[PDB]
């Protein structure tokens, strides 16, 4: 690690990992980043100059979600390459296993922002491959450290699935997940399944749950395993959901309603092709 601290907007954020900022920018202990267009700089002088020069107050895409002060922007890597590359370099500072930074054309980026009078301030994001061979509805996912543990991570996951639903497709985050990634997804999956298993008056196969939620059969099964809703007969695992098991887990710390939730009506997005 060479760059271990960044200045973005009014935040001083300590870097978690290495990021391959090009040339001599990778060797500087601190970097200054524009909170709107995400360009990186060596010196403070050029930062204080850029504030009164930059022509952006939002990410360079369509506002596809708006409720309250939350807005989500869709940025296509082909149309705004420079922006997404800068985002990916920023993102790598907090992701151990991020592989791509510059080949951004095949990717589409969904930026989470909080909006006020000044503009739309970046909170986090997730990236998504347009054509995924493994059916990955998320590639990397991130909530910037100052905004963490507010529920924004579970919003972004919930958001990625809402896209998948509107695409009539199942999806799963790129593996492997980090420890905080596992906790976030498992928490989200439990909440979704428990809400369905509480209300649904009918027979449910694992297949149905997948179609209802866009969660994969694999992710559903392992979620049900951790909720003690799977029994084992001759090696093979079969679903066993009871009103008692649902009731108990609803009161446990294994059930938690997300502080911030995606409201379907507030989504203003059309699926591609």
């Amino acid at each position: 690690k060479y760059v271990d601290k960044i200045h973005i907007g009014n935040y001083e954020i300590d870097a978690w990992y290495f990021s391959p900022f090009p040339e001599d920018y990778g060797k500087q202990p601190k970097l200054w980043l524009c909170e709107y267009c995400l360009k990186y700089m060596k010196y403070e002088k050029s930062y204080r100059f850029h504030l009164g020069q930059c022509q952006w107050r939002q990410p360079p895409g369509k506002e596809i979600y708006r409720k309250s002060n939350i807005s989500v922007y869709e940025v296509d890597g082909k149309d705004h390459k420079i922006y997404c590359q800068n985002l990916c370099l920023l993102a790598k500072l907090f992701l151990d296993h991020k592989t791509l930074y510059f080949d951004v054309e095949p990717f589409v980026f969904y930026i989470l922002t909080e909006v006020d009078r000044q503009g739309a301030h970046i909170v986090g994001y997730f990236s998504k491959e347009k054509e995924s061979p493994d059916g990955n509805n998320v590639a990397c996912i991130l909530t910037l450290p100052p905004y963490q543990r507010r529920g924004y991570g579970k919003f972004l996951i919930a958001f990625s699935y809402e896209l998948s639903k509107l695409e009539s497709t199942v999806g799963s985050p790129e593996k492997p997940l980090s420890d905080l990634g596992k906790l976030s997804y498992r928490s989200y999956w439990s909440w979704v399944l428990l809400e369905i298993l509480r209300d649904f008056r009918g027979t449910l196969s694992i297949k149905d749950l997948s179609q209802m939620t866009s969660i994969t059969q694999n992710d559903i099964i392992s979620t049900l395993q951790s909720l003690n809703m799977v029994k084992y007969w001759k090696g093979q695992h079969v679903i066993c959901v009871t009103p008692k098991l649902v009731e108990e887990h609803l009161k446990s710390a294994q059930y938690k309603k997300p502080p911030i939730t995606v409201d379907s009506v507030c989504l203003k997005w059309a699926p591609p092709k």
Partner: protein
């Protein structure tokens, strides 16, 4: 100390060759995975 050029073209120039590096590594891995899959499954 010094003022920096933050024009798009500056970034486009120092990213272009790195963008090509990744594309080549991605072609390498696609071929490597395809070759591995063929060799083990026979």
């Amino acid at each position: 100390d010094i003022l920096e050029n933050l024009d798009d073209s500056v970034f486009s120039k120092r990213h272009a060759k790195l963008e090509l590096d990744e594309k080549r590594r991605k072609r390498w891995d696609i071929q490597r995975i395809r070759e591995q899959r063929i060799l083990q499954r026979l």
